[PDB]
Design a protein around this ligand. Structure first.
Ligand code: NI
Ligand code: NI
Ligand code: NI
Ligand code: NI
Lengths: 122, 100, 570, 570, 100, 100
């Protein structure tokens, strides 16, 4: 009976994000001395050079977290994150200039990453 | 007086608070703009008194209670923000959920 | 990964099946569908999705499917649906309703809704977005009335007047070529869309028609200028030639005829019947019977909306002032009194709920309130839900059918009636970007932001000297869309086809966008969205009782309304 | 005949060696030189000197070395000096600084400063006169912000925005050709000089460059649009081609890089680093180290100026609102918190005093106060005198060195940074006559009269119905320079060379004076007047301690400031 | 507060009434604008209190009497009109010949 | 009411004086605009009371003393000027050095 003006009455259930896309869990370490926070929609291979992880596993992927949220790595912090697949055309341009085209060009992306000192190119 | 644009505008917050305080004094449960005016004027007068921003952030939660206002008003006011000249210049006070 | 519904709605606004209360009414709207792809919602801010290489595309130039403006996560309330979508604006027009972002990396992006270098963002998550209100009964009496209208979500003013002259204080009329030209030039400084009505009076065609050629967008027939069979006939002959609408305030006095005589003069031609209940004017006591006819587009004005315990007591003195009547003349008082009837006001509530009256309007400053058309529409819907129950057509416990019926009364239907729905009146692709954002707690009461031609024109915003825009005092203020020459590009002057063909805008130096009035003569009641009912309305001449399908239409006045003392300082 | 000093200063304002207190601060400025000839001072009024055949010449036509306007007996405070002179204005520009009057009978008249039939007079005796403030960090959010700025002596607004859209509420960006055109047209009605920044984001050149060709005067790189290595690089490539400045708010989150990565992307090219301390945005915690580099033009925004006991407590909620962050998202709060550091705010005070931060700015309505750039500059200088003492460079017990260092931060240095110092930013012959008169008791607090292009635009003046202009209420009011078409001649719209060459002003119907942005790419820290220090700034990543030349920079916050509760009603 | 244009304007009626009431309290016979302000503010506060339009139409005739005002003021005021938000929305109150 | 532009503006002097008088009543030393507002409103109310211009020129020097105001305020106020409607029409009152 009490009226809260403009209130919601949400339906039952839950919202599954990124449904139907492959998920991948990887370990990531902040080897730097300042905090690094990574948003939901950045091409994961193109994050800060001082994040150490298997860079190949970030290609064509982004964090599997709600749109507009982020993962925070304090200095020295290692943690596991879950990634999902990029969608749409699966192309990335700009950001760190590691891709500039299809995310299918793994060898070229990793070559650029290695030359520029992005940690974890194996 | 050399009033600037903000000084002119903020006079009308004081005025609205005076109006609202008269309505409260004759026994009326206050509405949304009335409640906002009272709390806002309280903050600006507190700054003028030389209180700190931190003091006003906590005092602002005890100016009006739910029995002072109409149904739903507490839930309509998520926060109140006001700027005023403290002894150390203009500062912003934000009072979160001022009426429980 | 899954998000619970409560948290999802807090972050992105509601999604399919969620309900939202309209202000402090009992009315609930339900999200019918959602254009998003869950996980790829657009949002803007620090570390958010609309960033270069991510949800913002860094490749495409503006012309390449990029938007000038994206409203993210809007809950649209429109005659076309109640649903969740992003809204994309370009060149001042709505170009896409769907899902915005970057096709590089996101699924389900509408192809012309790319967020690029050229794109501004307005966050609409948690807001209800509607078309701007279309007020077709405006008296141009006091320029301060424009902000009043904008503050309650009105974006188009159709009517007439030259300021506080007695003719304008009584009637929506800008008379003759010279007054019309002068008011078109005044309009260059009014931050709202405008169309001007000429005087629908004369026994020869040329004096009436020359107003249309001068730039009028329609005509008003008003009893104070003689709502005679001749004036009615000539005005409609002009309108049928010129493709503009005619509004009528009929002969209350029944001096030259009764309602049936007015209808005979109209002779099946299309007409917009103003304040059809009749307190605002018309054949006493039975003018509301016009709303049953297929060639009538019927509107109410707002002071009778809805029927309340104080409604009658305010009316006599309101009417005497408007119509320049004298308390010491018995027939003046008798004329006034003849127009104020609880029986027809009560029935008017119900006729709205049934879809028999199609439109709302203000009657601003001449027996009507410039800033309460939207307000009183929802108060009426709420009263009807309380007294008549949910409509039979409703599902899921929502009031979506009623909400579509009522939103149509002040958006799409007036636009259709006046021949301007190609430009304004609904949230549809290809229409002008006149959009109103509402916090649900303030819905229908005080607009958050009013967008005109794709730029914010009016907003509830705080201290201009503060570190951020939210500190007090938060009040309605004109924004950059109203400043300098931008006022020309964000607003439309609606004019007749003939005045446009004859170069009136260039002649007068008009810099505003020019809208063409058209397709006014080939419509009827059947074209009123969600409000298309034709029926025999019987009004008892002795008792004023209103019957439809053999049933007396009546209801009680209420002592209290929502959208009232919780919100207003006075 | 001799006049004692006290009486001389009361009548004509101060002369060589006299000192004047700035408002209620501890700061004293000393008259360094005086251009007058004692006994031939210009003054106007009943029985005074500027009369025909006397101090006014009655022979010469306007074109013959006669002034449109003479400001008599000004105490100029400028990067070029603190000194006493008459100021002569003609065709809206400062044409002479020296001694005005009539060469017929007066000694020492500057040859082009003749007072003739064509000359208006403003008495500046007893006033301090400065250049108009140049605010290079403006969010165009609420048009009411213009008067706020004028009232504290600001005459140029550089920045971006389209009104209270979320993109504009976070970032100084008017995105894309269409929004830029719309805001250039809005600018026609704003009584202040304006330049507009486009979105410095993209991975291809064309989407960024088309903003410059549309009429933008510069670009803003902001983290909320993705302050990535690519966006930084493309924006600077565009700027180097177009000769416009780029402002940066860097990646606070360190998402794509740390500070050293941003500097590598910049690659030695010129850039304006906004809110360089970082509470307003940038690589956490070490962004302030940018102010040591020779290719960086560093500015502060005003809420951290100066460090006070309440400064920290106001910031978290200010930031959350500006950047559209959610209190229920832990990483949003952590991002916000990462930006608020007493260690770097305290060091920022000292870096200003040392000439390592070159500029002040507001950040109006997006973590900054539109009317407090000038105010807080002097409060900072006063706090530094109290805590660090007179600078080593001072003489005569005056604070002239400090006053020149600090006045430069909001006048000449922002003008140099944005490529507009050929027109504005100082009291020099050949520059636009944007001048602010201050009563010393109100210096830096409330401007007396603001002159724009040689006509008064804003003034503290009283009752318009009174017998004289001084009776109450005395308040800030727009003057005739803002009315009608005069607003076009008294204000400048600054635009890129390419947009000017392509005829954008004619295309859009702009009537304002058009200023050309130029010489932005060939400057550095060495070109910042009185604030040209380059050095290695070390910021400890664990403690946030700031060191320069092996010394920790720290100071205490103060409980009280001058230029505060003595003056303001709220 | 979300003040609309009318809320802003009507604050100044309350203010003028407060001014006029202070003048009355120190013994002055009120002038035309003072008298109008007092009666107008009385009406709007009555609406806020939840009185009916009909109640205010009759109460408005007993707020000020001829001995409270200057010579000629009663005859200058033919009626006073005011709109305010009643519990049932905005309504117009017209008080005819408020001061006999 | 038929308010003209000056009547509207001068309401805000009365309002500022009311604000300032409340601040004085709770023990605050008044600042520059507060002091100016109080003295100005005093003058305009004096005119309304029917005092002469000469009476107000001398009374205006005794409204506030230096202990009522912040350091430096007396020296900041060289004079206060106000126009109001006296029984014999509008007149200007100038109070020189109102606070010694
Ligand atoms: Ni009518
Ligand atoms: Ni009408
Ligand atoms: Ni920033
Ligand atoms: Ni900013």
């Amino acid at each position: 009976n009490y009226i809260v003006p403009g209130e919601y009455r949400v339906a039952e259930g839950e919202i599954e994000i990124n449904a139907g896309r492959e998920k991948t869990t990887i370990r990531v370490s902040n080897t730097g001395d300042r905090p690094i926070q990574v948003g939901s929609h950045i091409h994961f291979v193109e994050v800060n050079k001082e994040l150490l992880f298997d860079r190949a596993e970030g290609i064509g992927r982004r964090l599997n977290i709600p749109s507009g949220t982020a993962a925070r790595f304090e200095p020295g912090e290692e943690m596991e994150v879950e990634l999902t697949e990029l969608g749409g055309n699966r192309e990335v341009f700009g950001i760190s200039d590691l891709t500039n085209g299809s995310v299918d060009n793994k060898e070229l992306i990793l070559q650029r990453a290695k030359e520029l000192g992005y940690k974890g190119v194996e | 007086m050399h009033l600037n644009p903000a000084e002119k505008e903020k006079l009308q917050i004081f005025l609205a608070s005076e109006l609202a305080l008269k309505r409260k004094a004759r026994g009326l449960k206050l509405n949304y703009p009335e409640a906002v005016a009272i709390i806002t004027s309280f903050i600006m007068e507190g700054a003028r008194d030389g209180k700190t921003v931190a003091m006003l952030m906590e005092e602002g939660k005890h100016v009006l209670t739910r029995d002072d206002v109409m149904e739903g008003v507490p839930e309509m006011i998520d926060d109140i923000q006001a700027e005023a000249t403290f002894p150390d210049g203009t500062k912003l006070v934000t009072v979160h959920n001022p009426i429980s | 990964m899954k998000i619970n519904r409560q948290q999802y709605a807090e972050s992105y606004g509601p999604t399919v099946g969620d309900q939202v209360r309209l202000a402090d009414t009992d009315l609930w709207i339900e999200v019918e569908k959602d254009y998003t792809t869950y996980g790829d919602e657009a949002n803007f801010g620090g570390g958010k999705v609309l960033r270069e290489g991510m949800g913002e595309n860094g490749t495409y130039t503006r012309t390449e499917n990029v938007l000038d403006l994206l409203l993210t996560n809007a809950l649209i309330l429109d005659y076309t649906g109640i649903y969740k979508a992003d809204i994309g604006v370009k060149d001042g027009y709505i170009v896409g309703i769907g899902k915005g972002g970057n096709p590089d990396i996101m699924d389900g992006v509408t192809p012309n809704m790319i967020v690029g270098t050229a794109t501004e963002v307005i966050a609409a998550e948690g807001k209800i977005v509607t078309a701007g209100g279309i007020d077709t009964h405006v008296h141009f009496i006091n320029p301060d009335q424009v902000d009043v209208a904008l503050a309650n979500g009105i974006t188009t003013l159709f009517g007439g007047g030259t300021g506080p002259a007695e003719g304008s204080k009584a009637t929506t009329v800008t008379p003759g070529p010279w007054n019309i030209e002068k008011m078109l030039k005044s309009t260059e400084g009014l931050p709202i869309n405008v169309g001007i009505l000429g005087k629908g009076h004369g026994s020869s065609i040329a004096p009436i028609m020359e107003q249309i050629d001068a730039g009028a967008a329609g005509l008003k027939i008003h009893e104070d200028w003689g709502a005679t069979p001749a004036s009615i006939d000539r005005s409609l002959t002009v309108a049928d030639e010129a493709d503009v609408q005619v509004a009528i305030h009929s002969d209350t006095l029944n001096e030259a005829g009764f309602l049936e005589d007015t209808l005979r003069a109209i002779n099946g031609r299309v007409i917009h019947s103003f304040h059809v209940e009749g307190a605002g004017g018309g054949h006493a006591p039975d003018i509301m019977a016009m709303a049953g006819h297929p060639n009538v587009l019927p509107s109410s004005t707002n002071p009778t909306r809805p029927f309340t315990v104080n409604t009658i007591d305010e009316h006599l003195d309101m009417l005497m002032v408007c119509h320049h009547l004298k308390q010491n003349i018995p027939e003046d008082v008798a004329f006034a009194d003849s127009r104020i009837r609880p029986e027809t006001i009560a029935a008017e509530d119900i006729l709205h709920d049934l879809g028999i009256i199609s439109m709302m309007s203000t009657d601003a400053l001449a027996m009507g309130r410039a800033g309460e058309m939207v307000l009183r529409t929802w108060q009426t819907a709420d009263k009807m839900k309380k007294q008549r129950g949910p409509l039979a057509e409703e599902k899921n416990g929502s009031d979506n059918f009623r909400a579509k019926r009522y939103v149509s009364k002040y958006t799409i239907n007036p636009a259709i009636a006046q021949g301007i729905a190609h430009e304004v009146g609904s949230i549809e692709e290809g229409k002008f970007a006149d959009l109103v954002l509402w916090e649900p707690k303030f819905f229908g009461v005080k607009a958050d932001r009013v967008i005109k031609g794709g730029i914010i024109a009016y907003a509830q915003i705080g201290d201009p000297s503060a570190s951020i825009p939210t500190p007090q005092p938060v009040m309605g203020r004109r924004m950059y869309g109203t400043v300098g020459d931008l006022i020309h590009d964000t607003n439309i002057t609606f004019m007749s086809k003939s005045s446009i063909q004859q170069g009136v805008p260039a002649k007068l130096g008009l810099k505003r966008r020019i809208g063409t009035v058209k397709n006014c003569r080939n419509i009827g009641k059947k074209d009123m969205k969600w409000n298309d009912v034709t029926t025999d309305i019987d009004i008892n001449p002795e008792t004023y009782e209103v019957k439809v399908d053999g049933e007396v239409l009546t209801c009680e006045p209420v002592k209290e309304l929502p959208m009232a003392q919780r919100y207003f300082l006075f």
